């Protein structure tokens, strides 16, 4: 588990900071309220999935929590886009 679950958290850690960075790359000073609202949500995903990855009994689920947390980040973007 240990060396595997570390890759699982690093995959979702980089996705959250990368998509926070792309949110800043499309943002403007007027709209910073939306940048912070999406940061506050993206950190909530990073937090929940960090706990699910450091608490998993099942190793074939660590590799999936990477995709579930990506679908959460992608959904949160696809929601705050509009």
Tell me the three-class secondary structure of 4-72, residue by residue. Answer: HHHHHHHHHHHHHHHHHHHHHHHCCHHHHHHHHHHHHHHHHHHHHHHHHHHCCCCHHHHHHHHHHHHHH
Domain total for the chain?
1
In eight-state DSSP terms, residue 1 is -
Structural biology method used: NMR
Q: Which two structure tokens, joined as six digits, stand for 47? A: 């937090």
3 state SS of 3? helix
d(CA 79, CA 38): 9
Residue 82, domain CATH: 1.20.81.20
| CA triple 34-23-27, angle to 5 deg | 65
CA–CA gap between residue 53 and residue 72 (Å, rounded)? 15
Q: Determine the structural domain holding residue 18 and report its residue range.
A: 1-82
């Amino acid at each position: 588990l240990d060396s595997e679950r570390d890759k699982a958290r690093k995959e979702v850690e980089e996705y959250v900071k990368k998509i926070v960075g792309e949110s800043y790359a499309k943002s403007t000073k007027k709209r910073h309220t939306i940048t912070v609202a999406l940061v506050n949500e993206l950190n909530n995903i990073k937090n929940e999935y960090l706990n699910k990855i450091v608490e998993s009994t099942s190793e074939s689920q660590l590799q999936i929590l990477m995709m579930e947390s990506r679908s959460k980040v992608d959904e949160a973007v696809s929601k705050f886009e509009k």
